[PDB]
Amino acid sequence: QDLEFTRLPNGLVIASLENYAPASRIGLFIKAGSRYEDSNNLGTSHLLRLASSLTTKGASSFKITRGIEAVGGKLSVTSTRESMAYTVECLRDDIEILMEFLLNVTAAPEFRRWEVAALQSQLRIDKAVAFQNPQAQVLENLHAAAYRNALANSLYCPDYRIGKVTPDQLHYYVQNHFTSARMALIGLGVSHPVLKQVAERFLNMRGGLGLSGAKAKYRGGEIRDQNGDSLVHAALVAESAATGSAEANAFSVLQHVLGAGPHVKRGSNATSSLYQAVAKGVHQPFDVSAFNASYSDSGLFGIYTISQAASAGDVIKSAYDQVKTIAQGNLSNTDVQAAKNKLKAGYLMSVESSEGFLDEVGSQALVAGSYVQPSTVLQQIDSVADADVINAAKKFVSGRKSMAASGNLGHTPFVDEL
């Protein structure tokens, strides 16, 4: 069938697609995240993400976990800086119980002191696991140095707040952000009326349009971390346009033109111009890709470079030189169309999976408030002209730069030098 996009008067999006799959998937995409935080409550979103199985008003922690496992289901909390999504997935027959459990978890959070104090420890473990790959830390520093507020907030609880998040803070966050207007219940494999019924059964109580954070402001700082690892992970970005704008699509096309994550295993990324440009200068092991983060209010476009400490400066300069060359106008229409093809294929393959489709629909409902068919997305992608890509390149090249680098910085250049 088709997506049954609907908006209740309170402001809650309910979308359902009856794919007739053996297993269904229901996700409540609450518009909350690190962005909607202030200095006093930094890290609260992280604990909320970790506090999925805490005892709720209707169901005990024991009951929650035991039931979810007994049906073989799974409850996952995916928290981006702007959207925190609670998703339940299980077989179709037992979907109702997991639905009740999910809405119990979201609607009625009972943050008992002892349980919150228990999960405070798990906070550190999760952050440590996430930070094993340097890229996570590098991106956190990137967002911190790019913005002065909102988006600058990290997705992992800061160290000084690891054991100091309070139940009252969690309650306040839920009350002021987990609101009906900021919520979007999207479920694949379930009927529309059941979704409407459950949504009106639990999520109705919280009034919509809760506490709203301020728009992020581009700081353009340089956060340099000296950790001693031989490989230096550096990322130089500048403020791109926010998602939903045509310039955002132009920036995505620009990202694919420059080069995105490899399409061939153990490939030299021949189409990716950044890789060739750096390779002609750097014959040492390296990896350069285009970073394009697009958030609701602002966006970031840049180049991520991984290379040896001595040769990191050469990699960064070469990649920036490639981007400058594109900005100059040396852009081939063949490359433009190829990048458009890559973007369209990437979008379609992303929405191919059940998880991909769920997250895409949730995002569209949460920000746009409507479902855009993939065909329309592809039409938007091809609508971007070459001039638009070159102009996005110009915006990056002649733009205030925010850089975050982690490793044996050493030769690693500074924003003023770049």
């Binding site: 995916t78 928290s79 696991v129 996430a130 994550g261 394009n292």
Partner: peptide, 23 residues
């Protein structure tokens, strides 16, 4: 497509996940 850092930790009945942006 370069990986939104996809740092979700594994789990059952409670599996937190996070994502940032392309790497």
């Amino acid at each position: 497509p370069l990986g939104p850092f996809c740092a979700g930790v594994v789990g059952h009945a409670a599996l937190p996940a996070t994502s940032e942006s392309p790497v």
